[PDB]
């Protein structure tokens, strides 16, 4: 699309997960956004990506933004493993 | 800051200009964000940058998002010249 990157960035900034949507969808949703943006030359690295994902991660997931401070060099895949683990216990 | 790029991206996505702030401040504000983001490896090119600026450009500036369709390959500087010109007439 002509307005591809801009809409991906706004979607990334307005992520709001609480536990309703399956992690499956939410993961591949964010995985795509970062892939598409990176295909178009906009590289959102793991550090910055995780930050934006954990932002707006509310509910019983809220806290993951607090341990993040100890989690340096955390990967997006790792971060979702955590989210997946939470969803399985619901 | 450790959370620099992420906060720059969210600032860019949540821009809301209507005519209150001087164009001077709003311009260099966005000019910096795009420079900082580009220094850190997040390449926001003119096309996508302008798109994100015109998004949330409300008030008497709204119409610049409509003329944009004729303005292909427009630069961020050009886009602000328009915003500056409108601000001068207020």
Residue numbers in the entry:
A (entry chain B), B (entry chain A): 261 to 350
Task: List sentences from the manuscript.
To further examine the effects of the A273V mutation, we determined the crystal structure of p18mAUG2-A273V. The protein crystallised in the same spacegroup as p18m with the same three copies arranged as two dimers in the ASU, but now with additional electron density for the A to V substitution on α1. Superposition of the three monomers shows the backbone conformation is near identical (RMSD = 0.16 ± 0.04 Å over 78 ± 3.6 Cα) as was also observed with WT p18m. In addition, the Dimer-1 interface contains the same set of apolar and H-bond interactions as in the WT structure. In p18m-A273V, it is apparent that the γ-methyl groups of V273 now also form part of the continuous apolar network. As a result of this shift, the V273 γ-methyl groups also pack across the dimer interface and maintain the same favourable 3.6 Å Van der Waals spacing as the β-methyl groups of A273 in the p18m structure. Analysis of the energetic contribution from A273 or V273 to the dimer interface using PDBePISA52 also suggests that both the A273–A273 and V273–V273 interactions are favourable and that V273–V273 packing actually contributes more than the A273–A273 packing to the free energy of the overall interaction. However, analysis of Tm derived from derivative plots gives values of 50.7 ± 0.4 °C for p18m and 45.8 ± 0.2 °C and 45.1 ± 0.3 °C for A273V and I269F mutants respectively, showing that these amino acid substitutions modestly reduce protein stability.
Excessive replication of Saccharomyces cerevisiae Ty1 retrotransposons is regulated by Copy Number Control, a process requiring the p22/p18 protein produced from a sub-genomic transcript initiated within Ty1 GAG. Thus, p22 is identical to the C-terminal half of Gag-p49 and is processed at the C-terminus by PR to generate a mature protein p18, that is identical to the C-terminal half of mature capsid Gag-p4525,27.
